[PDB]
């Protein structure tokens, strides 16, 4: 009773007509990048167009998250974090590093 707003979830945003909502990240990339945002800054849900420094991002902090960059396979540097602030932006930029590859899956070197 008293209106049961349970059934009432729809906010539905056409948009990103303000960095809130339609702005929730769309790939595995943006994925990796925002899950890995949110343990080193500590918010709740960083999104696509958060801008990595204003979300309590240092160049401190930057140097720390570039690491959980690199274990995931992608080449993350101050740099690349100061030219692309952005999480959309910063996860386009990311290439896949060959990690130092601890089990040849097939690689023989010369005896």
Same mark, same amino acid.
């Given at each position: 009773?008293?209106?049961?707003?349970?059934?009432?979830?729809?906010?539905?945003?056409?948009?990103?007509?303000?960095?809130?909502?339609?702005?929730?990240?769309?790939?595995?990339?943006?994925?990796?990048? /925002?899950?890995?945002?949110? @343990? $080193?800054?500590?918010?709740? +849900?960083?999104? #696509?167009?958060? !801008? *990595?420094?204003?979300?309590?991002?240092?160049?401190?902090?930057?140097?720390?998250?570039?690491?959980?960059?690199?274990? /995931?396979?992608?080449?993350? @540097? $101050?740099?690349?974090?100061? +030219?692309?602030? #952005?999480?959309? !932006? *910063?996860?386009?930029?990311?290439?896949?590093?060959?990690?130092?590859?601890?089990?040849?899956?097939?690689?023989?070197?010369?005896?």
């Amino acid at each position: 009773g008293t209106i049961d707003y349970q059934a009432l979830k729809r906010r539905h945003t056409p948009e990103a007509e303000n960095p809130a909502e339609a702005d929730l990240p769309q790939g595995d990339i943006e994925k990796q990048v /925002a899950a890995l945002w949110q @343990q $080193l800054l500590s918010t709740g +849900n960083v999104t #696509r167009e958060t !801008d *990595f420094f204003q979300q309590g991002g240092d160049s401190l902090l930057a140097t720390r998250l570039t690491g959980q960059l690199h274990q /995931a396979g992608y080449e993350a @540097q $101050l740099s690349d974090l100061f +030219n692309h602030p #952005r999480l959309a !932006d *910063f996860a386009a930029t990311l290439r896949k590093t060959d990690v130092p590859v601890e089990q040849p899956f097939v690689h023989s070197p010369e005896d």
